[PDB]
Structure 1
Amino acid sequence: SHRKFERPRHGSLGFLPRKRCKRLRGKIRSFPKDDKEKPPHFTAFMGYKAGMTHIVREVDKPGSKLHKKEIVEACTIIECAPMVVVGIVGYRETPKGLRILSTVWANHVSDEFRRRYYKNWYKSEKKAFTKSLNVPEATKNCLLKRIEKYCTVLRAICHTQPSKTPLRMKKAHIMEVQINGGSMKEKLEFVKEMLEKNLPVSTVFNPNEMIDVISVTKGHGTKGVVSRYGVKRLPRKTHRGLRKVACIGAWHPARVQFQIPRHGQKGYFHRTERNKKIYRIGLKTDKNSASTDADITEKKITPMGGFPHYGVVNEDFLLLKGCVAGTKKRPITLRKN
């Protein structure tokens, strides 16, 4: 029979299965779309976990009860050790998805990037990307002509440099960042300049725009139902313990449904936070970017007392609303909206 007191279920089925994520970096399912009218520029970025902090502000929303009065908010400041752009990948649409036409590497590559292709770097001969970077430019010209004639999605392999960060890790995280904008004829020339240099964030990131955050949440191992889905605790009189779901399904169907909350792994999931507007642009070396002309004190992005389980921060900064997922030292990925 029916329940006498109908109440909403526990957890969301949209985040199933609640299993350990396969990787550590934040993958991107979807990049922001492109338009012919809009001009060819960048489409995403990446970095690390610099801070999810506060800032004091003043609302300009008409009729707001606070408005002119000073307020306190919650935004974030990003860690951007400049990423090295190393590769170019072309994709063409097919009825079986978008397929890789080809990838092209920079004629010179870093050691940190190449270290990722190994599991025992200290014992190898470091032979990766050794004789693959001595190709003639006739092949490059022919294949980029093919890219223009056939390819329709352009992505750039960029890798981070953990040497700048205090991380123990020496392998470089590699991802691909889409390039969005105009037609192929303009796009070919617009993708012929930045093919080797490192990536400054302030190149495209501008104030008053929306971005999203991709990461992998923390980890807690196996946890009970009361933690994984927040089920009601059974009364203290319960015989075989109280931290469990009482009924895991009716008599029929004669099976356990997949909607029943059960014990298992919680955390180490893939998470994306949407509607995160970027607000301000700054740097790393300069001394007054974060502060204002009404604050008239001295400070830079530098923190105090060190960062617990993160070391010190010696790289770029911007501003963006919200707080982030993951743990300390965890790679974070930044997308546009």
Structure 2
Amino acid sequence: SHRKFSAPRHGSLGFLPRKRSSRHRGKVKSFPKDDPSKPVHLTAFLGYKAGMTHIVREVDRPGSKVNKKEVVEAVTIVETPPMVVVGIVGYVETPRGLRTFKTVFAEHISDECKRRFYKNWHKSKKKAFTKYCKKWQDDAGKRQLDKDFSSMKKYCQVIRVLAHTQMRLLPLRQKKAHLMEIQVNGGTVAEKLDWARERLEQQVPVSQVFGQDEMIDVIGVTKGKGYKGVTSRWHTKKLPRKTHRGLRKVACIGAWHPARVAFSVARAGQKGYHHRTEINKKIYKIGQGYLIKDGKLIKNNASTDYDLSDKSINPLGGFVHYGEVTNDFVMLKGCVVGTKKRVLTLRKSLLVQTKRRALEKIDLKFIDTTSKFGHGRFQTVEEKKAFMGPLKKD
């Protein structure tokens, strides 16, 4: 007979091959569609989930009950040291798909990018791109390089650029850079290719790609949670206390007569470590790195117009399980996917962003740099030293 009381279904079947991600770094499944009216630009960037904090800001949306009021907003900080462009690739439009036509690398590729081409960099003799670079210091190889760019002027429809993260700058253990194709969306393909050929072996910072109060797409792999049951992985009802063989189960799988269990029935298995794309993440603030000028460095990242204190966004005792963010960063409203130290693809938004909330401008009043390794209660070190007074170790 039928189910007595109707109910919605546990889980979504749109995400259903709930397996471990085959990739560690989030793939851009779709780049934004270009128009040649725009100038040439990048459409993606590759950063690292540093941590979380609060923000305090005035809200200007008319009609709300929180108009001209100060909210707090959870934000993520994504440490984004500038990427280095070491290759271009063009894609021809085919009736079977979009085939990669020809890849052209740079002359000087750093050891950071060279780590990626090796499953064991200790044991190896480090021979990658050593015959490729003989194309860049003769006449005949340069003629073939020019003919490759000219052969891409005619036939390529999509031009993507190869960029890697400058991994030396981060607090991470690893020295191996993440490569990534970023679709250059802009004017005509010849102008696009001249522009990317200009940027070869060059730094591309994040203010080049993004801006403040921009809605981005954040692509990455979910924090992994293991082999989990159907009460954790699918959030079904726990069975009553009196059940014999266990209660964190799905009691009825299916009926008798479709004599298979369906794919739509929820079973136990791998929860987390899934690839996701979560959209409409507002860039509250693009931050700046530490930099030295006039001898003494200037580090005041969390300094705002209403704070005017020389603190950086690094909380007390640093970020927990991450380290110190000494580079330029993007600060994103709300939470993003992944664990800490997780490489975190940023994508410009696919959608024509036209709302009241999505076009709101941002002026922050307070970036919270209290300690997150416990209940911190002091914003900076000298505040703590002035409140507590002198200690025994002084």
TM-score of the superposition, structure 2-length normalised? 0.82
Deviation at 1:281, TM superposition (A): 2.8
Hey, which bits of structure 1, 4+ residues long, moved more than 6 A?
A: none
**How many Å apart are 1:185 and its aligned residue?**
3.7
Q: Which moved more, 1:308-317 or 1:211-220?
A: 308-317
Aligned to 1:287: 299
Give the match for residue 168 of structure 2: 163
Q: Which residue of the partner structure matches residue 203 of structure 1?
A: 208
**Contact residue 53 and residue 323 of structure 1 kept, 8 A:** no
For the 8 Å contact 1:115–1:170, the answer to whether it is kept is yes
Instruction: Name 2:321's counterpart in structure 1.
Output: 309
273-282 vs 91-100, which deviates more?
273-282
Distance 1:273 1:231 in 2: 24
Question: Residue 146 of structure 2 aligns with which residue?
Answer: 141
> What is the deviation of 1:301?
3.1
Contact kept in structure 1, 2:84 and 2:202, CA below 8 Å: yes
Find out whether 1:43 has 2:46 as its counterpart. no
Segment drifting more, 3-12 vs 202-211:
202-211
1:140 match: secondary structure = helix
Q: 2:177 — aligned with what?
A: 172
Kindly report which structure 2 residues correspond to 1:1-337, keeping only aligned pairs within 5 A, or say none. Answer: 1-135=1-135, 136-285=141-290, 286-337=298-349
CA distance in 2, matches of 1:317, 1:120: 31
Q: What per-residue deviation string (whole Å, max 9, x for no partner) do you get for residues 123-168 of structure 1? A: 1111111111111221111111111111011111111132222222
CA contact (8 A) 1:212 1:334 kept: yes
Amino acid at match of 1:82: P
Letter aligned with residue 165 of structure 1: L
Distance 1:154 1:250 in 2: 52
Contact map agreement 2:286 2:331 (CA 8 A) in 1: yes
Q: 1 CA distance for matches of 2:41 and 2:24?
A: 28
Contact 1:213 1:273 in 2 (8 A): yes
In 2, Cα distance between equivalents of 1:188 and 1:142: 13
**Runs of 5+ consecutive residues of structure 2 not aligned to the other structure:** 136-140, 291-297, 350-394
**Offset at residue 287 of structure 1 (A):** 3.5
Q: Distance in 1 between matches of 2:227 and 2:209?
A: 42
1:292 counterpart letter in structure 2: T
**C-alpha separation in 2, matches of 1:76 and 1:241:** 39
* Shift in Å, 1:188: 3.3
- C-alpha separation between the residues in 2 aligned to 1:183 and 1:290? 40
Structure 1 contact 158–175 (Cα < 8 Å) conserved:
yes
What amino acid is the match of 1:51?
G
* CA–CA separation in structure 2 for the residues paired with 1:267 and 1:185: 43
Q: CA deviation at 1:231?
A: 0.8
Closer/same/farther in 2, CA of residues 218 and 53 from structure 1, 3 Å limit = same
Within 2, Cα distance between the matches of 1:218 and 1:332?
Answer: 12
Counterpart residue type for residue 328 of structure 1: K
Question: Does the 8 Å contact 1:28/1:214 carry over to 2?
Answer: yes
Q: CA deviation at 1:12?
A: 0.5
TM-score (norm 1): 0.96
Residue 52 (structure 1) shift: 3.2
- CA deviation string 1:180-210 (max 9, x = no partner): 0111243233223211112211123112321
Structure 1: how far apart are the matches of 2:301 and 2:112? 30
Give 1:257 deviation, angstroms: 0.4
SS class of match (2:131):
coil
CA contact (8 A) 1:31 1:178 kept: yes
Q: Deviation string for 1:35-84 (max 9, x for gaps)?
A: 12122211111110123332111111111111112221233332012221
Q: Distance in 2 between matches of 1:184 and 1:118?
A: 33
Letter aligned with residue 210 of structure 1: M
The CA distance in 1 between the partners of 2:117 and 2:182, in whole Å, is 19
TM superposition shift of 1:289 = 4.6
* TM-superposed deviation, 1:227: 0.3
* Superposed CA RMSD: 1.5
Partners of 1:25 and 1:240 lie apart in 2 by 40
Q: Alignment partner of 1:134: what SS? A: helix
- Between the aligned partners of 2:100 and 2:338, the Cα distance in structure 1 is 31
